[PDB]
Amino acid sequence: IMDIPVKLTVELGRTRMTIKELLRLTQGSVVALDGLAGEPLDILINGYLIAQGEVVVVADKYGVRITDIITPSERMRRLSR
Amino acid sequence: DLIMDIPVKLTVELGRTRMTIKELLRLTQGSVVALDGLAGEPLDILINGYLIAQGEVVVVADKYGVRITDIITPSERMRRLSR
Amino acid sequence: DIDLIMDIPVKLTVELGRTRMTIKELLRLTQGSVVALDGLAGEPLDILINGYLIAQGEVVVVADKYGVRITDIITPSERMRRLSR
Amino acid sequence: DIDLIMDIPVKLTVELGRTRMTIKELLRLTQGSVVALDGLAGEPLDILINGYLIAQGEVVVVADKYGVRITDIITPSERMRRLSR
Amino acid sequence: DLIMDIPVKLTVELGRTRMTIKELLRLTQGSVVALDGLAGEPLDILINGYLIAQGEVVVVADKYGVRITDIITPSERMRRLSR
Amino acid sequence: IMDIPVKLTVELGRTRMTIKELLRLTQGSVVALDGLAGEPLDILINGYLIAQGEVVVVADKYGVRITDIITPSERMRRLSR
Amino acid sequence: IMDIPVKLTVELGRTRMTIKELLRLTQGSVVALDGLAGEPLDILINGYLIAQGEVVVVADKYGVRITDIITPSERMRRLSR
Amino acid sequence: RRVVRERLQALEIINERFARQFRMGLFNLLRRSPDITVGAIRIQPYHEFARNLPVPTNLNLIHLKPLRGTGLVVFSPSLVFIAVDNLFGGDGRFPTKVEGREFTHTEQRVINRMLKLALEGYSDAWKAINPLEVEYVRSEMQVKFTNITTSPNDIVVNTPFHVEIGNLTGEFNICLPFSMIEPLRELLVNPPLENSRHEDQNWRDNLVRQVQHSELELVANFADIPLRLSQILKLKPGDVLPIEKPDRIIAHVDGVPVLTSQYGTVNGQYALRVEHLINPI
Amino acid sequence: RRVVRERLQALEIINERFARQFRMGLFNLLRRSPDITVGAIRIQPYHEFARNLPVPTNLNLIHLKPLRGTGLVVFSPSLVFIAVDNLFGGDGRFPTKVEGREFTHTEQRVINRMLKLALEGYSDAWKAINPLEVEYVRSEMQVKFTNITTSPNDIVVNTPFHVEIGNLTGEFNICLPFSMIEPLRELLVNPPLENSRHEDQNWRDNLVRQVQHSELELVANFADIPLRLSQILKLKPGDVLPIEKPDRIIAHVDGVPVLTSQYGTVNGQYALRVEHLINPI
């Protein structure tokens, strides 16, 4: 009920390999992730997820186009992934 | 290095904003929220929630690929955690 | 390169045992039901991280506090043998 | 330059401990609820100013009056190690 | 100097006025109050509520920048506190 | 209820760094703060905040354009800043 | 009642002989099975059968044309085979 | 920055059946059998569609309740000319081309008949699967005045059609915002499914009867301690790591927890005493 | 000294939809479709706007209850000439220019029709989001007589529009004081939001359900003593600093206090005994 500021978190994709694949890749090396072009992004608070939503840019400033609160159904599957 | 071949989880973020729960209360399910980092600045790159480096995404080979640019730089890491 | 990675937090997991079991059995299970595991009593428990095999160990109660004591580091050959089951 | 700054009042702060806790837990908490902290009993308390690490110390009751006695000055290397957690 | 790198909080003020609570009582939420210092005089600069020096703001680089002009000058500081 | 004069205080912006950045800067050095052009100013009494309001100048004399009493909501956030 | 992801399995035909017939056959050797062209395919979950159904390909991606849940009648005979 | 990708199955069949319905409707209307060639479904931003749109041409707004937003349809001047002369029985071998000149009252009225006929055809075709009412809003001349999408870069879906009557040919398009179908994004991808009769649900129940025969592998967890790989490297066999009190055991399969349990010593085996199934509802 | 900066989102869309409404209103009024080009929203002092205003031109006062102050609209002599000749059906290819000459009675009456039509259009457009009644007050010839703002340097917001009918063109502006929208300064910045249905609040409640799963780090404070950095420099490890009696402990997260508590010795650990949550209400 009582209000307080809190730290949020947005995550752009997750993959699974050793750092040495990218550690060998010096600066300027482009690397892709499971993140592709079009899918929405999730929001975390203090590292705890909330909701799904795309992010756009306005006035040279990013703006999240949030969609809906993440239910435990898809929360479980994204935790599993 | 006998544990070199261990997969790791990385985390890439856009930006932060000090946001009180009264704001989310009026934030609808289709609301728009900004961040602190300006557009065009390379995204910060982390692993398992731990800061590593920064990079920027580019539309290459029909997939979002992030171009690594900086190193851990522990002095800069200390400066960053000293905010 | 190696020095950069050293100061990085990582997670770890430990498993007790494995048993074949189907949804009929789990629905039949009720409050207080007892289920065993293939892990024999006293057998050292496997130790993994992020689902990746690391080592094996056993829990020892030192100063009325639970603590797992490892015993070995899995060789690549024995890891291959274990996964080839 | 240095002499100009010396006679300037400054603030200081001391912290007891840290615990992970969520709004569910705080709402469940009621009057008289007891909450612990990671700071072990008898452990010296960290001393900071304006949120900036300074030193560590412990409280000593001298002439039935509370007083904090410092024990060390944080080196830059140990400060970096502490912030790298 | 082992504590050189310590951030500090500064305070910049316009002017003062001896103001009795009966005046604020008739002062509405959209009222206007004057000060003691005349327009154009450099603003006093303080840190953590402690007098340091004075300066004036100038519209430079689309941001309010104050131009430091004087030093602590402890004799003048004593004269100022002797009011 | 009983009346008495009291000392007020107006604050033009606050930043966070060491004095040596400005101590090295000799007299005549311009330095900016979080204070920008347009935002209102707060009023303190004996160092205790009251209200938010811009300040204008009239007859070569500054005049505060106070707006409203500061509520604890924004009081807390400005204390945090 | 409670939901969980689970591993499926589809099986394309079964035969009975020693591996040495095919072990002698090096790579690139074509070998046929009881599976012919036209008959539907069965689906297993964790190795446990469910239903009968053909599989087609759409958008360069396979798609099963499932037909009906396998009853114990034909389940027994396919186990016997 | 604006990117969307997807693959669709059902709306292709929907467009085909609506095209057959529209073909027979035009046949009975103009006493002559037409032919409609449905083009490949187009996914493009609104600005790209507007650029590809041949000006001049008539655009019409048809709302789709209860989904917020309005649908759009377009018809070529060649199509309206050919349709109106066939209504008059004209051969069309001496055609005329009008550019910039707004449609007359009679031409707009003929457009109104095409609009109502197309609305009825698409209404029946769409309600054959999903009941979504279509209601005309307002015709428009210039695409910029339509301003349906929030941004010109907003990606929209367009269905092209090639309609001919003998020698006479033509082409018209049906374009829709992707936000119009965003709530039904999963449905349009899925191909149409028949049956749905009462025996279809017990068929699903038959599948459930098959499902009870399943194999599940549980995972038992005791400690999940965060450490450092430097500590792991300096760790050696025989090292001990303290663990907090595991007041309960979480049981999960491939990740998903199902219950909590208490460990116990049973018949010389590591056994667990379940407490209750985890129900997220 | 007078400075204001900001960025706006919603009023752009509001102006666009009002412009479409005004375009269709003028179309039905003059039996000819016009075109309105909305210029970039202008933020400038009142004196700057007056200087940029092309004299002669007609200015009109429209009050906006319950917000104190009056809104302003302007129309060009070219626009009024073109509109009135189109009302008479004149081609306008032999135009006339009048400067300094006040509008006749008939010209002022035609201006009255434009004023009422624009008032109705903006009323519906604005009430589509926020209900704020607009009521005309008094037309004005010279900008100095309008004297709406307290000072000429008072920064005002103006919305320019470019209106044409075929070859005939024109431009009129809608300028508003910033104090007119100062109470709604936060609202105009925010882009328009849809829904607001009953499921929108429980959607916010759904977000709250997500919020209960949050991580919070508390801060415990014992002594906040004001000292001098000279004393800090002369301080050496082993030094002791007296502290008054901490009758209670303040607990805050990132600064914001939430409760008060009493320290205690529990299970060999520094534990605190909470008293009550801090409620500022």
Q: Give C33's contacts in chain H (Cβ within 8 Å).
A: 273-274
Residue found under tokens 């000292």: I227
Q: Is the peptide bond before H56 cis (omega within 30 degrees of 0)?
A: yes
Distance from CA of A61 to the nearest CA of G (A): 38
- The nearest CA of chain F is from the CA of D39 a distance in Å of 25
Rg, Å, chain A Cα set: 16
Residue pairs between chains A and C whose CB atoms are closer than 8 Å: 5
CA distance B78 to chain D (A): 7
Q: Are H19 and H172 in contact (CB under 8 A)?
A: no
Residues of B in contact with D83 (CB under 8 A): 78, 81-82
Q: Which chain D residue lies closest to E51 (C-alpha atoms)?
A: D8
Q: Which residue from F minimizes the CA distance to D50?
A: F16
Query: Nearest CB to B39: which of A14, A62, A66?
Result: A62
Give the residue among I205, D26, F70 at the shortest CA–CA distance from A2. Answer: D26
Determination technique for this entry? cryo-EM
Cβ neighbours of I4 in F, within 8 Å: 38
Residues F47, E49: C-beta atoms closer than 8 Å: yes
Answer yes or no: are the C-beta atoms of H174 and H163 closer than 8 Å: no
Taking the C-alpha atoms of residue I267 and residue A12, their distance in angstroms, rounded to an integer, is 43
Phi/psi at G11 (nearest 5 deg)?
-120, 125
Resolution (A): 4.6
- The span from the first CA to the last CA of chain A, in angstroms, equals 33
- Using CA atoms, how far residue H33 sits from A57, H28, H29, H166, in Å, is 51, 8, 9, 8
Q: Give CA separation, A62 vs A35, A57, B40, F35, in Å.
A: 18, 4, 9, 24
- Check: CB of residue G59 under 8 Å from CB of residue G77: no
For I116-125, letters b (16+ CB in 10 Å) and e give ebbbebbbeb
I191 → chain H, closest CA residue: H150
Question: Which chain A residue is nearest to residue H4, measuring alpha carbons?
Answer: A38
Distance CA G12, CA H138 (A): 57
Residue A35, token pair as written in the block:
């993140």
CA distance D47 to chain F (A): 19
Task: Determine the residue type at E52.
Answer: I
Burial E58-82 (b: 16+ CB within 10 A, else e): eeeeebbbbbbeeebeeeebeeeee
Mutation for testing the I interface, residue in A1, A6, A52 having most I CBs under 10 Å: A6
Instruction: For residues A18 and C52, give the distance between their C-alpha atoms in angstroms, rounded to a whole number.
Output: 12
Query: How do beta strands F41-45 and F5-6 pair?
Result: unpaired
Q: Report how far residue G71's alpha carbon sits from residue H42's, in angstroms, rounded to the nearest whole number.
A: 44
- In this complex, the residue of B9, B38, B66 whose CB is nearest that of residue A60 is B38
CB pairs under 8 A between F and I: 18
E-state strands within D1-85:
9-10, 13-14, 20-21, 34-40, 45-49, 52-62, 65-73
Q: What is the DSSP letter of I31?
A: T
Residues 6+ apart with CB under 8 A from I83: I26, I30, I110, I114
Are the CB atoms for H158 and H174 separated by under 8 Å?
A: yes
Q: Where are the alpha helices (DSSP H) in F1-81?
A: 19-24, 72-80
Distance from CA of I205 to the nearest CA of D (A): 15
User: Chain I contacts of B29, Cβ < 8 Å?
Assistant: 195, 200, 203-204, 206-207
Of D9, D52, D73, the CB nearest to E48: D9
Backbone angles phi, psi at G13, to 5 degrees: 85, 155
Q: What residues form DSSP beta bridges with I265?
A: I270
Cβ of D49 within 8 Å of Cβ of E6? The answer is: yes
Query: Which residue, among A57, A76, A77, would best test binding to H if mutated, counting the most H CBs under 10 Å from its CB?
Result: A76
Tokens read off for H34: 């037409």
Q: How far is E16 from chain I (nearest CA, A)?
A: 21
Q: Which run of H or of E encompasses G51?
A: strand G48-58
CA of E15: how far to CAs of D74, E44, F31, F64, H109, in Å? 41, 8, 20, 11, 76
CB-defined contacts B:D, below 8 A: 9
| Rounded distance between C-alpha atoms, residue F67 and residue F50, angstroms | 11
**Touch between chain G and chain H: 3 or more Cβ pairs under 8 Å:** yes
Interface test with E, best of D3, D6, D50, D53 (most E CBs within 10 A): D50
Strand ranges for chain H from DSSP E: 35-38, 42-45, 58-65, 70-75, 133-140, 155-164, 171-177, 216-217, 219-221, 227-228, 240-242, 249-253, 256-266, 269-277
**Is chain B adjacent to chain A, meaning 3+ CB pairs within 8 angstroms?**
yes
- Chosen for mutation from H70, H138, H145 (greatest number of chain I CBs closer than 10 Å) is H145
DSSP H39: P
Across the interface, of F56, F62, F66, the residue whose CB is closest to E29 is: F66
Evaluate whether E64 touches E57 at the Cβ level (below 8 Å).
yes
Count of other CB atoms within 10 angstroms of residue H274: 20
Chain I positions touching H68 (Cβ under 8 A) are 194
CB contact under 8 A, A5 and F73: no
Torsion, Cα I137 I141 I143 I148, to 10 degrees, reads -10
Taking the C-alpha atoms of residue G14 and residue G35, their distance in angstroms, rounded to an integer, is 7
The C-alpha atoms of residue C22 and residue D35 are separated, in whole angstroms, by 42
Interface of A with F in 3-22 (CB under 8 A): 3, 5
Chain F closest CA to I164's CA: distance in Å? Answer: 37
Å between A36 CA and nearest CA of chain I: 26
Chain F CB contacts of A3 under 8 Å are: 73
- Chosen from E1, E3, E14, E67 to mutate, greatest number of chain F CBs within 10 A: E14
Two tokens at I97?
């220019």
F38/I254 CB distance under 8 A: no
Beta-carbon contacts of I158 under 8 Å, excluding residues fewer than 6 positions away, are I41, I42, I43, I44, I49, I173, I174, I175, I176
H interface residues, B as partner, C-beta within 8 Å: 229, 232-233
Q: Please give the Cα distance from I74 to I139 (Å, whole number).
A: 9
Q: Does A81 touch chain G (CB under 8 A)?
A: no
Q: For residue B9, which residues of chain A lie inside 8 Å, CB to CB?
A: 14, 16
